């Protein structure tokens, strides 16, 4: 209902420029302070921009001014971010956030928006077919996946059967290998008694370099 | 100009309390009743618990509050549960600018020590062809998170090429890890057998595989 | 870690026979008493059939006394349920459940099959685009989705990009029509200024009918 | 074989507690001490929260408790919160069989007012050349879950071809529902506009579509 939904995040080189958006819905845009909050990997919050519901007035964290602007327009109902002379500890998910009373606090949050900030350059992934066994299935249950290889930056989405398929499907965090790619691996496990009757399809999306790959998982 | 201090960490077992104080100066945490607090579960958005010092959010428990003494504001957690398990950050409003505080991390423990389920895959035909070859070990819900890998190539131990992340706890706060043997399609074709071997308090698992 | 997988629900006509069974792993099976519970729509749970750790002793409710067989096989470790002259009110979905001490209860779960007993054939659905209007696209959100009309039985997935897409993500209950078929719509709210270079895709799965069908929705 | 009688429904505000009675026969209940209690979402399967009588499974707060009198066991749940909300059947061992009881539905009041948020799709393309058009009311995130749905065309109501489904609960204890008007292609064009007027606590909202 009352929802906040932003794009334009990115990897980008150190010096460039970003812009990021939100659009708000739900609720009385025009009436509510807006910030962005950013979040470096593993690090905490850090507030950065305000801009209160009027629009002109803006408040920045001293560690982004003269460099970035929020705005806003309130018949869009939409707040910006333009993010000039980018360094490596810009790095962060940036999250979109609102609050209707100033001094209340914030509690509209958009989903975050990921921007990397790095001498980059992106990296689209190998994926591999997991084969189950023919060892492992005696017994009830078979091990299948995807390996999803030298990616970067972060992050890859995995799926089962283009979304289909949930139960019994674990992807786990990534590995930063020495190369400074990044590379993961899905697994399902399932009856192996579906495996001659039952398609598997690993459905991977990395955004940063515009890769989807569908690769179907077969015993060998 | 200004930093509000937090503990770092806390824990707490099933049932019990923990407060988490946020210090910050007359100009902010004293110098307005606009504290808030934030938890935050890994990957998801801050969700704003109290407000105002002492108000909590629409459906946050009673076992949620928050206190001030003068430059100090505390949130107090009661019956500490599984779910509670995440970050918190205070916040104030100072002046011409707000300022989110250093973030504490909440343990909760107890939970049942859990031995890993660990699943090891061979190279694939695909990356063979590709003249790459990847040794895959996946190790999944332990508790607590910590377990070590070894590897091995017939009889005997292979220290070169492994990648090993750093366990995370799962949804349910039981962690998962993975460890990568990279090898050259001839020295995976050059042994009967590769194992992955991964101890967690003192016991060992096993798993391994070979070329056909 | 702890998991039961079954397989082996779906639509069979009055008289029928179907076979469930339940693939387990993570635990010592042929150690562990195991029952079948099912759950009629709207309604309770009930407990249908027990086998215990071994095998050969077998309990059955009597509203299946006759008609059903529970088995196993401790050396495959899976559960078997075999259920012949089926009747409509055998339709529910069904679970297998685990239980160490007897008497205990049962703490392992699997994701449960549905089973529909009708004299109604299956019938996949058709698929509709529900394009986002270019009116509330002066402002800054804009509404798209899918109808899904006229399918029975029982259920429709709906997934969008494959996937990856799952923020804004929207999908409807299903309504009952006077012909006995189903009909649902899923809706995604995205940022009107993606609605030019983001391309959204629904992704329909009906097993009864063996039905996937992507659709790409676009403006109009 | 026979039944473990439950109350059908039972309700409480946040913070209270509520318990829950089973009564069966010197048989069951009062059979043996094996007695469990489930807790289940909509959706999902069955949770194990209490055995023999009065033990809590791993990771259930001390929020919940059960006991037992004769032949009636009781489940409590104290401290209420939105997420106890959900279905609860007690389970007994009964010698030949086991039961499950006849089930609970735990509903936790407060939650505030919500408004629907009504989306209204005219007819497709693809769906006006197959010679069949859907106009599609959808209704979300509203508390109580109770609304009212009026269709216009022009002016003046339409009643013929609607079919609306029942308030169901999204996620969040807050309310969807749909509603649905089949119209001819040549209806559709015979009118400049189309409505879906949606009321919910004397108040009305109301979208409206137009062949264009």
């Known amino acids: 209902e009352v929802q906040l939904l932003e794009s334009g995040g990115g990897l980008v080189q150190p010096g460039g420029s970003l812009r990021l958006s939100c659009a708000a819905s739900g609720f009385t845009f025009s009436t509510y302070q807006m910030s962005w909050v950013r979040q470096a990997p593993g690090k905490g919050l850090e507030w950065?921009?305000?801009?209160?519901?009027?629009?002109?007035?803006?408040?920045?964290?001293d560690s982004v001014k003269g460099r970035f602007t929020i705005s806003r327009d309130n018949s869009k109902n939409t707040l910006y971010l333009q993010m000039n002379s980018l360094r490596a500890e810009d790095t962060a998910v940036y999250y979109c956030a609102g609050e209707l009373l100033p001094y209340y606090g914030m509690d509209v949050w958009g989903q975050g928006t990921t921007v990397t900030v790095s001498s980059a350059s992106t990296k689209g992934p190998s994926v591999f077919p997991l084969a189950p066994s023919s060892k492992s299935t005696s017994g009830g249950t078979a091990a299948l996946g995807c390996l999803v290889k030298d990616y970067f930056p972060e992050p890859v989405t995995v799926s089962w059967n283009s979304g289909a398929l949930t139960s019994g499907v674990h992807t786990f965090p990534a590995v930063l290998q020495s190369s400074g790619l990044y590379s993961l691996s899905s697994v399902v496990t399932v009856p192996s008694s579906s495996l001659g009757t039952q398609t598997y399809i690993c459905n991977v999306n990395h955004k940063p370099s515009n890769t989807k790959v569908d690769k179907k998982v077969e015993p060998k | 100009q200004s930093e509000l201090t937090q503990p770092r960490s806390v824990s707490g077992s099933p049932g019990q309390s923990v407060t988490i104080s946020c210090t910050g100066t007359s100009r902010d945490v004293g110098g307005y009743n606009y504290v808030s607090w934030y938890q935050q579960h890994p990957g998801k958005a801050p969700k704003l618990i109290i407000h105002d010092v002492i108000e909590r959010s629409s459906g946050v428990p009673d076992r949620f509050s928050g206190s001030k003494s003068g430059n100090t504001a505390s949130l107090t957690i009661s019956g500490l549960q599984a779910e509670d398990e995440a970050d918190?950050?205070?916040?104030?409003?100072?002046?011409?600018?707000?300022?989110?505080?250093?973030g504490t991390d909440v343990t909760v423990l107890g939970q049942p020590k859990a031995n890993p389920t660990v699943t090891l895959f061979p190279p694939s035909s695909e990356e063979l062809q590709a003249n790459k070859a990847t040794l895959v070990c996946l190790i999944s819900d332990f508790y607590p998170g910590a377990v070590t890998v070894a590897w091995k190539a017939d009889g005997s131990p292979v220290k070169a090429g492994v990648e090993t992340t750093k366990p995370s706890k799962q949804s349910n706060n039981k962690y998962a890890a993975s460890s990568y043997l990279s090898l050259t399609p001839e020295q995976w074709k050059s042994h009967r057998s590769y194992s992955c071997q991964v101890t967690h308090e003192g016991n060992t698992v096993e798993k391994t595989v070979a070329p056909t | 870690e702890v998991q039961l997988l079954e397989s082996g629900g779906g639509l069979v006509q009055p008289g029928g026979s179907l076979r469930l069974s339940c693939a387990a792993s993570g635990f010592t099976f042929s150690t562990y008493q195991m029952s079948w519970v099912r759950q009629a729509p709207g309604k309770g749970l009930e407990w249908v059939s027990g086998?215990?750790?071994?095998?050969?002793?077998?309990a059955y409710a009597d509203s299946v006394k006759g008609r059903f067989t529970i088995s196993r096989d401790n050396s495959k470790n899976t559960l078997y349920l075999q259920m012949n002259s089926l009747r409509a009110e055998d339709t529910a979905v069904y679970y297998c459940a685990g239980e160490l001490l007897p008497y205990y209860g049962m703490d392992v779960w699997g994701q449960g099959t549905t089973v529909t007993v009708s004299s109604a054939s299956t019938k996949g659905p058709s698929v509709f685009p529900l394009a986002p209007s270019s009116k509330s696209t002066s402002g800054g959100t804009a509404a798209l989705g899918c109808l899904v009309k006229d399918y029975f039985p029982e259920p429709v997935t709906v997934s969008w990009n494959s996937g990856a897409l799952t923020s804004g993500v929207h999908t409807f209950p299903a309504v009952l029509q006077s012909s006995g078929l189903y009909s649902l719509s899923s809706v995604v709210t995205v940022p009107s200024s993606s609605l030019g270079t983001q391309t959204y895709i629904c992704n329909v799965n009906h097993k009864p009918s063996n039905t996937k069908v992507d659709k790409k929705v676009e403006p109009k | 074989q026979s039944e473990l009688t439950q109350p059908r429904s039972v309700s409480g505000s946040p913070g209270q507690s509520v318990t829950i009675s089973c009564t069966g026969t010197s048989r069951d209940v009062g059979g043996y001490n094996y007695v469990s209690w489930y807790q289940q979402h909509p959706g999902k399967a069955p949770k194990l929260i209490i055995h023999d009588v009065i033990e809590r499974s791993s990771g259930v707060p001390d929020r919940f408790s059960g006991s037992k009198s004769g032949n009636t066991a009781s489940l409590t749940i104290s401290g209420l919160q939105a997420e106890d909300e959900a279905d609860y059947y007690c389970?007994?061992?009964?010698?030949?069989?086991?039961?499950f009881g006849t089930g609970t539905d735990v509903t936790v009041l407060g939650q505030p007012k919500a408004n629907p948020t009504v989306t209204l799709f005219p007819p497709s393309s693809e769906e006006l050349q197959a010679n069949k058009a859907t106009l599609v009311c959808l209704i979300s995130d509203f508390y109580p879950g109770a609304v009212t749905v009026a269709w216009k065309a022009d002016g003046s109501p339409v009643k013929a071809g609607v079919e609306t489904t029942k308030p169901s609960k999204q996620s969040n204890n807050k309310y969807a529902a749909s509603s649905y008007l089949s119209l001819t292609p040549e209806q559709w064009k015979s009118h400049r506009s189309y409505s879906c007027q949606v009321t919910h606590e004397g108040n009305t909202v109301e979208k409206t579509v137009a062949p264009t």
């Open positions: 389970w007994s061992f009964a010698g030949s069989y086991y039961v």
């Open positions: 086998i215990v750790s071994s095998g050969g002793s077998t």
